[PDB]
Amino acid sequence: GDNPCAAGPPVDTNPAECCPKPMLVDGTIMMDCYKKYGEQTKKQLQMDGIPRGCCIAECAMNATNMYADGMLKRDDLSKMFMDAVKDKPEWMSLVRDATNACFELAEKKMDEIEAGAKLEPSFEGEKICHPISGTILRCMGMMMFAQCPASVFNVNENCNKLREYGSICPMI
Amino acid sequence: GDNPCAAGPPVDTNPAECCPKPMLVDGTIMMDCYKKYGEQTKKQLQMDGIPRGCCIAECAMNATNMYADGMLKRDDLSKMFMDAVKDKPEWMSLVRDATNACFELAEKKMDEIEAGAKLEPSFEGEKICHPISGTILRCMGMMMFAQCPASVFNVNENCNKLREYGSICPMI
Ligand code: NA
Ligand code: NA
Ligand code: NA
Ligand code: NA
Ligand code: NA
Ligand code: NA
Ligand code: NA
DSSP B172: -
CA atoms within 13 A on the CB side of B98: 25
Contact A172 B30 (CB under 8 A): yes
How far apart, in Å, are the Cα atoms of A53 and each of A117, A120, A125?
A: 7, 12, 15
Burial A38-53 (b: 16+ CB within 10 A, else e): bebbbebbeeeebbbb
How far apart, in Å, are the Cα atoms of A127 and each of A55, A59, A119, A121?
A: 8, 11, 10, 7
The whole-angstrom separation of Cα A69 and Cα A57 is 15
Q: Give me the sign of the Cα torsion angle A53, A55, A60, A62.
A: positive
A93 alpha-carbon distance from chain centroid: 18
Q: Which of A12, A45, A105 sits opposite B164 (nearest CB)?
A: A45
B71 sits in which H/E element: strand B71-72
- Quick one: how many helices (H) and strands (E) in chain B? 8, 2
> Which one, of B73, B77, B75, B34, lies nearest residue B56 by Cα?
B34
- Please tell me what resolution, in angstroms, this structure has: 2.2
Cβ-in-10-Å burial (0-12, 13-18, 19+) of A113 comes to buried
| CATH 1.10.238.270 for the A1-172 domain, yes or no | yes
Pick the residue from chain B with its C-alpha nearest to A93. B109
The whole-angstrom separation of Cα A92 and Cα A98 is 10
Q: Which of B6, B11, B41 sits opposite A14 (nearest CB)?
A: B6
Q: Which of residues 60-99 of A touch B (CB under 8 A)?
A: 97
The answer to whether A102 and A22 are in contact (CB under 8 A) is no
Q: What is the DSSP string of B14-34?
A: -HHHHS-PPPSS-HHHHHHHH
Residues contacting residue A72 through CB under 8 Å, at least 6 positions apart:
A61, A66, A130, A132, A133, A136
| Strand, helix or coil for residue B3 | coil
B68 sits in which H/E element: strand B67-68
CB count within 10 Å of CB A137 equals 25
The whole-angstrom separation of Cα B143 and Cα B95 is 8
Domain ranges of chain B: 1-172
Pairing of strands A71-72, B71-72: unpaired
DSSP B67: E
Q: Which residues pair with B72 in a beta bridge?
A: B67
The answer to whether A145 and A15 are in contact (CB under 8 A) is yes
- Angle (nearest 5°) at CA A167 between B12 and A15: 60
Q: What is the DSSP string of chain A?
A: --STTTT-S-TT--HHHHS----SS-HHHHHHHHHHHHHHHHHHTT--SSPPPPHHHHHHHHHTT-EETTEE-HHHHHHHHHHHTTT-GGGHHHHHHHHHHHHHHHHHTHHHHHHHHT---SSTT-----THHHHHHHHHHHHHHHT--TTT---SHHHHHHHHHHHHGGG-
Residues contacting residue B72 through CB under 8 Å, at least 6 positions apart:
B61, B66, B132, B133, B136
Contact A171 B57 (CB under 8 A): yes
CA atoms within 13 A on the CB side of B63: 18
The whole-angstrom separation of Cα A88 and Cα A90 is 5
Residues contacting residue A4 through CB under 8 Å, at least 6 positions apart:
A164, A165, A168, A169, B38
> Which one, of B161, B154, B168, B172, lies nearest residue B19 by Cα?
B154
> Which one, of B111, B129, B124, B143, lies nearest residue B53 by Cα?
B129
Pairing of strands A71-72, A67-68: antiparallel
The whole-angstrom separation of Cα B45 and Cα A8 is 18
Cα A35 to averaged position of ligand 6 atoms, centre (Å): 36
